[PDB]
Amino acid sequence: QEGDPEAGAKAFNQCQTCHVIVDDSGTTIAGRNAKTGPNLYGVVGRTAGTQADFKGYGEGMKEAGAKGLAWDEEHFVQYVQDPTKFLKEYTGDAKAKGKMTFKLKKEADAHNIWAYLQQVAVRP
């Protein structure tokens, strides 16, 4: 919401190596065909670790979603900044790591990509 969606659309290039945003009709809104990560379409407000077509979720992600994690900005930003650190605290498991552990470099990108998802990845 307070980030720059247009700056986020551009910062999304960092994520398209592994994600894609493809609406229910099947149109690619961002990215080409990366499957490593889950389709980010409809992630806003979605319960962590529940994208129907994804099969590579780590246990930490499936459990955080089971403990009640649905994506909002606050969380989404903490997560991409340090994904392990976030899964350990949310999950309470000091042994959770996740399938992606790189830490985002800028916090602004995080807010901007969120403002962009809020503009293109919200499942009506």
Ligand code: HEC
């Ligand atoms: C590949 C090297 C990745 C890059 C680059 C990015 N993401 Fe990612 N993401 C990846 C994986 C394998 C997973 C699964 C994590 C696991 O432990 O299971 C994810 C997950 C996410 C999620 C969770 C979505 C869900 O369905 O609950 C989000 C919110 C997410 N990724 C965001 C994201 C953003 C914004 C990126 C660019 C800055 C990005 N990812 C890059 C793998 C990879």
